[PDB]
């Protein structure tokens, strides 16, 4: 027979089965960090399925590297890097052509700009539906540069709220900061930002990313903003995480 | 009992991991996170049975 047989000595049928390793697989899963800990490095959270039990595969290198991308293209694995893909806000630490082709095909036809536009207009419709009760004069769609959707180094204005009054806004606090202290100041125009990112395994913390982006862009020169008071909403498309750190006027946070 | 076989097994495990690394990318990495190989096949990973002292 043309195949070299590792089991030249035993027959499954006559001897039975001389070893079992299901326990090995289960202990392997446990030691890897649980099913969830295994899946955190995966792109699963970017697929936004609710749970992992009800799925199946279809019987792969390309699928294998794309599915394990958020833990492979991390800055720790490859250094001296962060060349950015075109028309996209994604960072590929290291030249990973297979991940690169997967990432272009997964973002074809100006898809990143479409997400930015859609998030903007949906939040605009939300604020139009909630204009009067929040004491909003109007909502202004800021002139957004076509490449602003994939402009990481700096940022510009996206959505503006005019009050027709002077809003009382609070200190810059995260979207979940139910306990927020008053800023002891007032403002009339309120800015909102839509920041998109592809969190890798090590830097998928949307809260820290949002806080850093808000505190850097507000104190930045290539980031012209109509008012010091506003919010910067960072949305991690990679793990479908979101957080906003900027100031909050009454009713704005909930 | 055979020590040379333990050393050989670890060397060959590293060789398999390194060939996977080279197939995945041309440049050789630093601290490739091992959960890529050892994750069970039904959970996406390759499913490498280990015979070495690899620490997670």
């Amino acid at each position: 027979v043309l195949k070299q047989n590792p089991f030249w000595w035993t027959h499954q049928r006559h001897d039975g089965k001389l070893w079992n390793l299901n326990n090995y697989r289960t202990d392997m899963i446990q030691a890897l960090g649980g099913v969830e800990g295994i899946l955190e490095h995966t792109l699963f959270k970017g697929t936004y399925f609710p749970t992992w039990e009800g799925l199946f595969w279809e019987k792969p290198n390309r699928r294998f590297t794309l599915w394990w991308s958020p833990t492979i293209n991390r800055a720790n694995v490859y250094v001296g890097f962060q060349v950015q893909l075109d028309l996209t806000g994604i960072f590929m630490h290291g030249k990973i052509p297979t991940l690169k082709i997967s990432l272009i095909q997964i973002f074809r036809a100006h898809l990143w700009q479409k997400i930015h536009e859609s998030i903007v207009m949906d939040l605009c419709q939300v604020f139009d539906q909630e204009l009067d009760a929040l004491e909003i004069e109007t909502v202004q769609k800021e002139t957004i540069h076509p490449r602003k959707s994939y402009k990481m180094n700096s940022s510009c204005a996206d959505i503006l709220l005019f009050a027709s009054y002077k809003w009382n806004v609070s200190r810059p606090s995260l979207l979940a900061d139910s306990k927020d202290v008053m800023d002891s100041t007032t403002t009339q125009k309120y800015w909102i930002d839509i920041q998109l990112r592809w969190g890798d395994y090590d830097s998928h913390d949307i809260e820290r990313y949002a806080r850093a982006k808000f505190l850097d862009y507000t104190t930045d020169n290539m980031s012209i903003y109509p008012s010091p008071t506003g919010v910067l909403i960072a949305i991690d498309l990679a793990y479908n995480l979101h957080s906003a750190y900027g100031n909050w006027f009454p009713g704005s946070k909930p | 009992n055979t020590q040379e076989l333990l050393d050989l097994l670890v060397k060959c495990e590293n060789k398999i991991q390194t060939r996977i690394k080279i197939g995945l990318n041309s440049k050789m990495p630093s601290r490739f996170p091992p959960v890529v190989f050892y994750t069970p096949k039904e959970l996406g990973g390759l499913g490498m049975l280990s015979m070495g002292h690899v620490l997670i």
């Binding site: 079992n20 326990n23 | 333990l6 590293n14 991991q17 601290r31 091992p34 280990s50 002292h53």
Partner: peptide, 27 residues
């Protein structure tokens, strides 16, 4: 913490060849 395997020679003092070896139950 490098990801390369380490030679098991000398790191097995605390284990036996069968420790954690389990036999499946009837199906």
């Amino acid at each position: 913490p490098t990801g390369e395997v380490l030679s098991l020679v000398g790191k097995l003092e605390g284990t036996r060849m069968g420790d954690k070896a389990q036999r499946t139950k009837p199906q």
